[PDB]
Write an enzyme that holds these catalytic residues in place. Sequence first.
Site, PDB file in Angstrom:
ATOM      1  N   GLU A   1       0.788  -1.243   0.000  1.00 35.21           N
ATOM      2  CA  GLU A   1       0.000   0.000   0.000  1.00 35.21           C
ATOM      3  C   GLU A   1       0.826   1.302   0.000  1.00 35.21           C
ATOM      4  O   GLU A   1       0.460   2.281   0.665  1.00 35.21           O
ATOM      5  CB  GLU A   1      -0.964  -0.006   1.202  1.00 35.21           C
ATOM      6  CG  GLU A   1      -0.277   0.081   2.622  1.00 35.21           C
ATOM      7  CD  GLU A   1       0.090  -1.280   3.238  1.00 35.21           C
ATOM      8  OE1 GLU A   1       0.295  -2.245   2.480  1.00 35.21           O
ATOM      9  OE2 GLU A   1       0.196  -1.374   4.490  1.00 35.21           O
TER      10      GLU A   1
ATOM     11  N   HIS B   1      -8.056  -4.296  -1.273  1.00 33.89           N
ATOM     12  CA  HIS B   1      -7.309  -4.358  -0.020  1.00 33.89           C
ATOM     13  C   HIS B   1      -6.293  -3.221   0.098  1.00 33.89           C
ATOM     14  O   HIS B   1      -6.273  -2.508   1.090  1.00 33.89           O
ATOM     15  CB  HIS B   1      -6.601  -5.720   0.129  1.00 33.89           C
ATOM     16  CG  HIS B   1      -5.781  -5.856   1.375  1.00 33.89           C
ATOM     17  ND1 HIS B   1      -6.225  -6.543   2.482  1.00 33.89           N
ATOM     18  CD2 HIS B   1      -4.546  -5.394   1.691  1.00 33.89           C
ATOM     19  CE1 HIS B   1      -5.299  -6.504   3.424  1.00 33.89           C
ATOM     20  NE2 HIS B   1      -4.280  -5.795   2.977  1.00 33.89           N
ATOM     21  N   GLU B   2      -5.431  -3.063  -0.902  1.00 33.73           N
ATOM     22  CA  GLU B   2      -4.401  -2.019  -0.783  1.00 33.73           C
ATOM     23  C   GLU B   2      -5.031  -0.619  -0.787  1.00 33.73           C
ATOM     24  O   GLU B   2      -4.562   0.282  -0.081  1.00 33.73           O
ATOM     25  CB  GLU B   2      -3.328  -2.157  -1.865  1.00 33.73           C
ATOM     26  CG  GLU B   2      -2.623  -3.531  -1.974  1.00 33.73           C
ATOM     27  CD  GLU B   2      -2.131  -4.137  -0.653  1.00 33.73           C
ATOM     28  OE1 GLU B   2      -1.887  -3.415   0.345  1.00 33.73           O
ATOM     29  OE2 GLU B   2      -1.963  -5.387  -0.632  1.00 33.73           O
TER      30      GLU B   2
ATOM     31  N   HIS C   1      -6.065   0.299   2.797  1.00 38.16           N
ATOM     32  CA  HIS C   1      -4.959   0.815   3.644  1.00 38.16           C
ATOM     33  C   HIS C   1      -4.776   2.338   3.612  1.00 38.16           C
ATOM     34  O   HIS C   1      -4.137   2.892   4.517  1.00 38.16           O
ATOM     35  CB  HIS C   1      -3.604   0.193   3.283  1.00 38.16           C
ATOM     36  CG  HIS C   1      -3.360  -1.165   3.871  1.00 38.16           C
ATOM     37  ND1 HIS C   1      -3.372  -1.410   5.231  1.00 38.16           N
ATOM     38  CD2 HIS C   1      -3.065  -2.348   3.276  1.00 38.16           C
ATOM     39  CE1 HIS C   1      -3.086  -2.684   5.449  1.00 38.16           C
ATOM     40  NE2 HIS C   1      -2.879  -3.269   4.281  1.00 38.16           N
TER      41      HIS C   1
ATOM     42  N   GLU D   1      -3.852  -4.840   9.387  1.00 34.72           N
ATOM     43  CA  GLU D   1      -4.332  -5.866   8.445  1.00 34.72           C
ATOM     44  C   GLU D   1      -5.764  -6.344   8.679  1.00 34.72           C
ATOM     45  O   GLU D   1      -6.515  -6.513   7.725  1.00 34.72           O
ATOM     46  CB  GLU D   1      -3.348  -7.045   8.355  1.00 34.72           C
ATOM     47  CG  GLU D   1      -1.953  -6.613   7.838  1.00 34.72           C
ATOM     48  CD  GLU D   1      -1.964  -6.038   6.429  1.00 34.72           C
ATOM     49  OE1 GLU D   1      -2.967  -6.194   5.701  1.00 34.72           O
ATOM     50  OE2 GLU D   1      -0.957  -5.425   6.034  1.00 34.72           O
TER      51      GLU D   1
ATOM     52  N   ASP E   1       9.782 -10.653   9.498  1.00 36.66           N
ATOM     53  CA  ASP E   1       9.659 -11.453   8.270  1.00 36.66           C
ATOM     54  C   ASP E   1       9.475 -12.937   8.576  1.00 36.66           C
ATOM     55  O   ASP E   1       8.835 -13.652   7.805  1.00 36.66           O
ATOM     56  CB  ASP E   1      10.851 -11.247   7.338  1.00 36.66           C
ATOM     57  CG  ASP E   1      10.807  -9.903   6.631  1.00 36.66           C
ATOM     58  OD1 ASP E   1       9.689  -9.437   6.327  1.00 36.66           O
ATOM     59  OD2 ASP E   1      11.874  -9.316   6.382  1.00 36.66           O
TER      60      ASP E   1
ATOM     61  N   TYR F   1      -4.107 -11.049   9.811  1.00 35.47           N
ATOM     62  CA  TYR F   1      -5.139 -10.860   8.790  1.00 35.47           C
ATOM     63  C   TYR F   1      -6.470 -11.482   9.204  1.00 35.47           C
ATOM     64  O   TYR F   1      -7.491 -10.802   9.276  1.00 35.47           O
ATOM     65  CB  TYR F   1      -4.692 -11.482   7.456  1.00 35.47           C
ATOM     66  CG  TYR F   1      -3.506 -10.791   6.818  1.00 35.47           C
ATOM     67  CD1 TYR F   1      -2.198 -11.085   7.217  1.00 35.47           C
ATOM     68  CD2 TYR F   1      -3.692  -9.857   5.799  1.00 35.47           C
ATOM     69  CE1 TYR F   1      -1.095 -10.432   6.623  1.00 35.47           C
ATOM     70  CE2 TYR F   1      -2.614  -9.214   5.203  1.00 35.47           C
ATOM     71  CZ  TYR F   1      -1.317  -9.499   5.623  1.00 35.47           C
ATOM     72  OH  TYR F   1      -0.252  -8.862   5.020  1.00 35.47           O
TER      73      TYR F   1
HETATM   74  C1  LIG Z   1      -5.163  -9.036  -0.177  1.00 33.94           C
HETATM   75  C2  LIG Z   1      -4.032  -8.955   0.839  1.00 33.94           C
HETATM   76  C3  LIG Z   1      -4.241 -10.049   1.890  1.00 33.94           C
HETATM   77  C4  LIG Z   1      -2.707  -9.081   0.086  1.00 33.94           C
HETATM   78  C5  LIG Z   1      -1.447  -9.207   0.937  1.00 33.94           C
HETATM   79  N1  LIG Z   1      -0.806  -7.889   1.008  1.00 33.94           N
HETATM   80  C6  LIG Z   1      -0.929  -7.107   2.080  1.00 33.94           C
HETATM   81  O1  LIG Z   1      -1.607  -7.402   3.049  1.00 33.94           O
HETATM   82  C7  LIG Z   1      -0.203  -5.798   2.056  1.00 33.94           C
HETATM   83  O2  LIG Z   1      -1.157  -4.784   2.338  1.00 33.94           O
HETATM   84  C8  LIG Z   1       0.896  -5.791   3.113  1.00 33.94           C
HETATM   85  N2  LIG Z   1       1.466  -4.455   3.225  1.00 33.94           N
HETATM   86  C9  LIG Z   1       2.001  -6.775   2.735  1.00 33.94           C
HETATM   87  C10 LIG Z   1       3.130  -6.746   3.754  1.00 33.94           C
HETATM   88  C11 LIG Z   1       2.892  -7.035   5.098  1.00 33.94           C
HETATM   89  C12 LIG Z   1       3.952  -7.027   6.019  1.00 33.94           C
HETATM   90  C13 LIG Z   1       5.248  -6.739   5.577  1.00 33.94           C
HETATM   91  C14 LIG Z   1       5.491  -6.450   4.228  1.00 33.94           C
HETATM   92  C15 LIG Z   1       4.425  -6.459   3.319  1.00 33.94           C
HETATM   93  C16 LIG Z   1      -0.503 -10.112   0.197  1.00 33.94           C
HETATM   94  O3  LIG Z   1      -0.740 -11.339   0.111  1.00 33.94           O
HETATM   95  O4  LIG Z   1       0.493  -9.595  -0.341  1.00 33.94           O
HETATM   96  O1  LIG Z   2       5.871  -8.061   8.814  1.00 34.98           O
HETATM   97  C1  LIG Z   2       5.255  -8.217  10.018  1.00 34.98           C
HETATM   98  C2  LIG Z   2       4.944  -7.086  10.783  1.00 34.98           C
HETATM   99  C3  LIG Z   2       4.319  -7.246  12.022  1.00 34.98           C
HETATM  100  C4  LIG Z   2       4.000  -8.527  12.473  1.00 34.98           C
HETATM  101  N1  LIG Z   2       3.404  -9.018  13.593  1.00 34.98           N
HETATM  102  C5  LIG Z   2       3.344 -10.385  13.547  1.00 34.98           C
HETATM  103  C6  LIG Z   2       3.908 -10.853  12.366  1.00 34.98           C
HETATM  104  C7  LIG Z   2       4.318  -9.649  11.717  1.00 34.98           C
HETATM  105  C8  LIG Z   2       4.945  -9.506  10.481  1.00 34.98           C
HETATM  106 ZN   LIG Z   3      -2.488  -5.311   3.900  1.00 33.46          ZN
END
Ligand SMILES: CC(C)C[C@H](NC(=O)[C@@H](O)[C@H](N)Cc1ccccc1)C(=O)O
Ligand SMILES: Oc1ccc2[nH]ccc2c1
Ligand SMILES: [Zn+2]
EC number: 3.3.2.6
Length: 607
Positions: A268, A292-293, A296, A315, A372, A380
């Site tokens: 996002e 979704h994005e 955000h 999330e 990570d 989520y």
């Molecule tokens: C429809 C969504 C569930 C898609 C999901 N993407 C996201 O949730 C993004 O908004 C998140 N920003 C992806 C993310 C989370 C933590 C660290 C780095 C990147 C994905 O699967 O990439």
């Molecule tokens: O990338 C992320 C950021 C926050 C979080 N809390 C728990 C898993 C996690 C991963």
């Molecule tokens: Zn997200």
Amino acid sequence: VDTCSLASPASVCRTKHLHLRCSVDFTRRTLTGTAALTVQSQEDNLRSLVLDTKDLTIEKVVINGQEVKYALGERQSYKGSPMEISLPIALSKNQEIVIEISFETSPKSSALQWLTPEQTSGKEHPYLFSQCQAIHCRAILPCQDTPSVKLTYTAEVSVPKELVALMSAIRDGETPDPEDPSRKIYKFIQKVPIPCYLIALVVGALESRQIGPRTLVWSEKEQVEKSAYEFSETESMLKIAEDLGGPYVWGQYDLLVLPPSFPYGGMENPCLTFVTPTLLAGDKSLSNVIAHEISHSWTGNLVTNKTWDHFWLNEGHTVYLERHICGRLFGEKFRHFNALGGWGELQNSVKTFGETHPFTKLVVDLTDIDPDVAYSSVPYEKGFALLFYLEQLLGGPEIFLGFLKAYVEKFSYKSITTDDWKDFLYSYFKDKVDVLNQVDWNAWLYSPGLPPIKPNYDMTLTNACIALSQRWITAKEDDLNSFNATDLKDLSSHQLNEFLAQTLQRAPLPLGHIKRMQEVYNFNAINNSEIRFRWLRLCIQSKWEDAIPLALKMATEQGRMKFTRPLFKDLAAFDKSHDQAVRTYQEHKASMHPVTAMLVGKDLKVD
Ligand SMILES: CC(C)C[C@H](NC(=O)[C@@H](O)[C@H](N)Cc1ccccc1)C(=O)O
Ligand SMILES: Oc1ccc2[nH]ccc2c1
Ligand SMILES: [Zn+2]
Ligand SMILES: [Yb+3]
Ligand SMILES: [Yb+3]
Ligand SMILES: [Yb+3]
């Protein structure tokens, strides 16, 4: 306190603005330049401060036109190295100064992927993209790398003149580079205060096409036409999101379609959402990722989690809004179908980790945990489930959406904790506090495993998926003949995907069953990335040797972690493909995204 950051916390000092002047050097795979941080003291007699860095080379630090003393502390694993700066004059509370740091990134920056021309679509030019969330901004520039601090930014980025730079900001013009006429300078301004994880940069052979009044799609030339069609619902989604959330404050909503190694489905980045090319199904069926994005832009980018322990706030609320957008577009029965699907994915995650594992808690403690490594569907789907349960408890979707909009208004431009959210929930639902007190808050927020209560789901669209999956699971050899291409007649791509998800939950199936499934349904022919992913997993877990090359190809020809990690893991667990899996990883590792490379390595127990 933000246990993921080594920098001075917001109670000590606060970054107000970043001015970034840098040059992208493809020959050296370095970003070089200056980060000028406008920093406001939050304390009397402030004489030093500490910043996050990771694999950065510091040349000098300048304040009031003079070089000052600084020291880099010892590396603390994935957190990087703290950078202490000695201020030349003690600051009083609320005093602001500008600190200019000259720096250079490492080619191994965990924030960056550098692509050769052969790794791109056009094959002539190289390409660079960043990914800062959660804690990789420190691997691009020195900063307080914590979402508890919000700052505006301006940037000037020098790039080879044949290439285009874009950032998470409004485009502010381009000029030849006065220092090197083989280069161009692109300028950018982000006038809305953001957490630093939302800083983003792409440099490459990019073209754009307008697809709505406030949206261009950007990609290499060969993906532009397909992407413009795939994401044509974007403006209608923005309009629904504005109805739910309040005004969209960011000006532009552009989309960037990345090369296949992008590790996420979407990100996002403000003014410029980044998406995987694995969304390009040809029928818009994966557009929930766009919804979704988009969401955000309120839940995450306006109201932000104060630390990563409270990630579910970002999330959970966003999935809740996502599913509402899709529900408006395609019906309430579709919203319930996707809600139920998400509970299924939560089931999977809990089973994978184990029902008592700390990462299945909604609110986590990330002290000494790399975000990570802890990342999963839990924040989520456990987060969405809580909100969906509260919706049903408190009187339905229009009542609860009233809360969401008031929540966004209340905490806009702020960073908050779970307690802040809960306090406001109780304040808003002042007249339903007795109902609220029936919630098992301690279990929902702080206990591992599946939530204490499953919400109520309409089954209408799901029933056929479950019915067909059960026919296959209970079939014996003499039943295989009865299956036929006509079974799929009245199923949408969403339903086919859910049929496969249901069936994958009971994998392995007998090899003869899987062979029959290919015979009659020809799943090998489907290009939809979600469907192909679950089908290949089903095949590999059911020990079909024929699926080995297909799974290897999908695992490596794209790099979305959602797909790449479980495909490698399944391939490693199948004795016939195990050595190939490890070999293919080792051969591809150097040209993989740094984060993906690291996690697949851990998954496979290699290096
Ligand atoms: C429809 C969504 C569930 C898609 C999901 N993407 C996201 O949730 C993004 O908004 C998140 N920003 C992806 C993310 C989370 C933590 C660290 C780095 C990147 C994905 O699967 O990439
Ligand atoms: O990338 C992320 C950021 C926050 C979080 N809390 C728990 C898993 C996690 C991963
Ligand atoms: Zn997200
Ligand atoms: Yb301008
Ligand atoms: Yb039989
Ligand atoms: Yb080794």
